[PDB]
From a paper:
CpGH89 (EC 3.2.1.50, CPF_0859), also referred to as AgnC, is a family 89 α-N-acetyl-d-glucosaminidase that has been shown to specifically release terminal α-linked GlcNAc from the disaccharide GlcNAc-α-1,4-Gal and demonstrated to liberate GlcNAc from crude class III porcine gastric mucin. Overall, the enzyme comprises a glycoside hydrolase family 89 (GH89) catalytic module, four FIVAR (found in various molecular architectures) modules, an unknown module, a C-terminal fibronectin type III-like (FN3-like) module, and six putative carbohydrate-binding modules (CBMs). CBMs are presently classified into over 60 amino acid sequenced based families; the CBMs from CpGH89 all belong to CBM family 32, which is one of the most diverse CBM families. Thus, CpGH89 possesses a complex multimodular architecture where the composite modules function together to efficiently act on components of mucin.
Residue numbers in the entry: 1208 to 1343
Write the structure that this text describes.
Amino acid sequence: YVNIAENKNVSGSNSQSGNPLSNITDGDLSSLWISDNGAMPANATIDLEGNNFVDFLELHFEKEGFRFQFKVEVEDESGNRETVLDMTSNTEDNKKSYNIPVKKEISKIHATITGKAPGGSFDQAWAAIAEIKAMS
Ligand SMILES: [Ca+2]
């Protein structure tokens, strides 16, 4: 597979110094975007520059065990925006990473961390994403 998201422009909400939005598409699963002052909601958008077939996305967090509530949406050149993964009511431990089928042409990826459920090992963690890949 080829990660067509790699080095694509990331826009979105404010970031902690040292942990910019650009860390979402740098290809490094260890480099993070972290929301500034741990603000929620926090959001990131990847511009794929026009419509590109995407088989699936991968959303990577720093490590397993957060309890973020989040959603992933895709959009085409049309303006048709659509939710592909909705974990906004999540209360359980999160996996380290999520595969998400798309199987169509898309032009943008939108990730939003809307909240966090109580408990687990990292209950004061700030909203943060290690990587989003778009495989074709
Ligand atoms: Ca990264």
